[PDB]
Amino acid sequence: VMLHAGYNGDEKLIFSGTVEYVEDDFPEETRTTKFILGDGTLNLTTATTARSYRKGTPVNSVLNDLIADLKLPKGRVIDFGNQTLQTSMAFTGNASQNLANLAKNTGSTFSVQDGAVYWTKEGSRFNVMFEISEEGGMVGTPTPKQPSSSKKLIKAHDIKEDVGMTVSTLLNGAILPESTVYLNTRYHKGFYKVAELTHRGGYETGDWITELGLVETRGELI
């Protein structure tokens, strides 16, 4: 299934995946069909692996080997350079789970989205690919919201996230969680990463907007 939306002149791809669930209820006057769609759910939850490596293996080789197993297109990857394994490693089970574990110990973010594999590094960000302002159909002023529902103990890697903001805008499917945005308002100004998206829509009645959860960055400009 694919979904498109826009304003009377064009429609941007907004979701693509598989129909996980479907049910029909038809009480008297109106039938109401329901769907639940998953973005690559089948691949992420069944791709098994069985790999091993010895001391001295370059970490850049391990990353590429595991992603090819996952069987998805590579949206964007940031290789490790000349990093080498310090101890022997073994990987089994779902490939996605093993990769998500390598994320913790190397400061890298792994997440599949609209079929594309994205591997980036935490703290750092990519140009102004999007600008938000009253001309750009903004909805209300930005407000500061914490990016997590809990607080961590601190020494007070330092480079990690820990701050963010929130913004809302008219529906625009040409945005992705790993992108970068520029916020041109009258109070807040600067560059931010994206961390979360939510698209809502009511054709005849309801909103037609998108909500972005931004996170401050403190790393290098990869």
Partner: protein, 184 residues
């Protein structure tokens, strides 16, 4: 990141296993009891969180030591364990010393193995020989029949070809396959 409902359970389960569900761990003997063999183990592994905090296992007391034995303990190979030997440790599911404990896997020491040859203490191994060895007393059996007892001043070898060569620094006694008997 932390928005999905499943990630919350993932982190909760990951943190739950951290404080429980101890199964196996390496260690080093620091205290040895020779009557009713038992050893005190100090686990070696640890981790440091990004918040500048560390997790250290405490000293574990009186872990029973296993040795190859049978016949109700009448046959056993009791080697001379010393403090500092590197051994692997196993934790029992339930507190075998009590029948009322409500917890499980809470560092209930099960037993310890004689020794494990890891990095930093890797002794050499003979490619093909069953050598039972002590500080300076060696017993070597080779697949081709030959057996030998050695020490820095005596040697008692029985070779495959009917050769007996009981020997000593002050003299020797030998028997040839041809039935000869001699005294050196």
């Amino acid at each position: 990141y932390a928005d999905r409902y499943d990630a919350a359970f993932g982190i909760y389960i990951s943190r739950f296993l951290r404080n429980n569900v101890h199964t196996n761990i390496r260690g080093k003997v620091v205290g040895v009891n020779y009557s009713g063999p038992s050893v005190d183990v100090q686990p070696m592994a640890y981790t440091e969180f990004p918040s500048g905090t560390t997790d250290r296992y405490p000293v574990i007391y009186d872990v029973p030591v296993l040795l190859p034995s049978g016949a109700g303990g009448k046959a056993r190979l009791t080697m001379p364990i010393k403090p500092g030997d590197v051994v692997g440790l196993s934790f029992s599911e339930r507190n075998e010393g009590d029948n009322n404990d409500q917890n499980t896997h809470q560092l209930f020491a099960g037993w310890a193995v004689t020794q494990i040859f890891t990095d930093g203490n890797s002794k050499a191994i003979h490619p093909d020989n069953v050598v039972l060895e002590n500080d300076k007393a060696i017993i070597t059996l080779k697949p081709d029949g030959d057996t030998s007892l050695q020490n820095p001043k005596v040697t008692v070898e029985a070779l495959a070809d009917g050769n007996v060569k009981i020997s000593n620094g002050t003299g020797e006694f030998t028997m040839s396959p041809s039935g000869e008997i001699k005294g050196g």
